[PDB]
Symmetry: C3
Subunit: 249 residues, 3 copies
């Protein structure tokens, strides 16, 4: 049928966690080459795209491509049953009415069934060829900056010249984090490639959701274009989780 | 290999009718989760995208994905043979030469080779998003079509204005969003990020409104420089029309 | 599992040759209806899309979709063994550790290519309507690009008139051609459909890679839109497209 075993349930847990607080219901297409999924939020201001490759699984077998509609709050609830390092394996049939999530801890074990639903899959490819600027920084730093400036206001501005400035201007005060590219410990390097400069403003509400993809990666990529939704990538082991966020006009 | 049974042939008939007279000839990709098909027209000003989910069928089985190239007029003519309550079943074998349409009389349509270049031009967010009775929309378009061959649309705050201007004269229809709690299917819905001013070909709008035979309501998403999207939702599915505006 | 035979390895050879020195590596998705592949260059200025239909093969059987990650230089090297008249047959198994390229003649060599893991994030940037769509003999086009790329590293296009103009340090040059229909030889006719006029400047070095695709087709299609990447297509039951981002 279909069976996919995460060596540690922790991974799939963190993966769902990342876009859990973003969107509501989501379609999961499982193909021969692994699992892809996409969801757009309430206001259609934010899209989450997720690609999980075969080598992120301890084992992966999908004979017939299978889509799985899922309520994210439900799936998360089943995923808190958890116990982290334990082998989690999703199992679905040819035409499944439900997906089986099977936990095994090395001691012994539990099996759960999530009932799937029908969702219309209108899948978006809004990603561009070249974005005006492409930067990458430690996800932790980015997390900190967003969390700090989101104190001062609801709207955070990002400016790239070669200089990257983060600016919040509120009804209390303002704040500015200016950071510049360098190479060092490669995990801490701030990389920047700039074609034409960029000045873009985003809802902090959303950015705070985007940054909790920090649990999946050391580093975040950020690609920005003038008229386009900005793209925020957290790379997986053979995969990624990206957030497309439409700028404010 | 592939067998898909509509409860009533009337549905497939009305779908194909819906985007017939719009586009030329169309590639139908049948997968495990059902049928998607796309076609662009003569001047490439209009694209039809169709998704039919698995639960719009009385039953559906597709073992391996199969594409079916089809001449829309040929298929339509074969679909004229329908009793509109007869149970239509499409059938294809592993590498189809032809597709069998079975009414309950059996027909065969010989397939064509077409190039599969497929278009995702849909956008994340559109400036304005409205929805209204497909009937009302078809009326407005049909009326304004009389006065000129170019119909313009303006979304303001709570204002939606349709305006035609030509040699004969000038029409204007103005509707506002409202919630009718007696009958929710007639309620006019509108969401607006930025206002929009967009002109479209009446020739094309007239083709687009023919999809009103599939749905109570039509959604309309308008972005400022992007092709406007007109959606008629189905039972587990939809038929959408992407129409490029006028410069 | 997966078995695909080209009547002449010549074809697969010139296909890979076309985008070989353009892009870094490539992901080949083989499906029931045939092969598609996409690659972006390092500057992400140039995308190559490739569609090869079922009927570009002497025989084609793909039971279930299989993706094959490949190093282009490696593949090309294993394709240098081709006779250009030999029947090349690609073979891959359920989960593809390696692809088997099999050359055979009327008088047989079997090569194995180690497959890599590439993240496939595929782009659909193609538009509905392009401001201008023209088509000319690939021959002519390659000559024009080759000539103007002498005078400058930036070649400009202006569209019933099609003007190619390069202005560099040493000098400038202008080739102007107009749409015409030729009853004698339709393959040499230049066609133009213009909704809006277009003015676009491109990198010469990239256009020079793009014209390499001339070995695959009599004619090149060119679709130029104002803010968008221009689309250069060489047809094959299939095609090879080069999406090239204009310069600002």
């Amino acid at each position: 049928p279909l069976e996919a075993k995460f060596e540690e349930a922790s991974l799939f847990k963190r993966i769902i966690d990342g876009f859990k607080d973003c969107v509501q219901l989501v379609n999961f297409q499982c193909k021969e080459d692994g699992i892809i999924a996409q969801a757009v939020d309430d206001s259609r201001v934010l899209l989450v795209s997720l690609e999980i490759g075969v080598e992120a699984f301890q084992e992966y077998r999908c004979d017939h491509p299978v889509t799985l509609g899922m309520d994210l709050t439900s799936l998360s609830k089943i995923l808190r049953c958890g116990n982290n390092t334990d082998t989690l394996t999703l199992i679905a049939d040819n035409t499944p009415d439900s997906i089986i999530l099977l936990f095994e801890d090395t001691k012994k074990i539990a099996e759960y069934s999530l009932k799937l639903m029908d969702i219309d899959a209108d899948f978006l490819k809004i990603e561009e060829l070249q974005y005006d600027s492409t930067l990458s920084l430690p996800s932790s730093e980015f997390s900190k900056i967003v969390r700090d400036l989101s104190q001062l206001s609801d709207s955070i501005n990002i400016m790239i010249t070669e200089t990257i400035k983060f600016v919040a201007d509120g009804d209390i005060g303002s704040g500015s984090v200016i950071i510049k590219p360098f190479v060092d410990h490669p995990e801490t390097s701030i990389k920047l490639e700039m074609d034409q400069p960029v000045d873009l403003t985003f809802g902090a509400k959303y950015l705070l959701d985007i940054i909790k993809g920090s649990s999946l990666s050391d580093r975040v990529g950020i690609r920005l274009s003038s008229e386009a939704p900005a793209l925020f990538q957290f790379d997986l082991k053979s995969g990624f989780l990206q957030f497309f966020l439409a700028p404010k006009f």
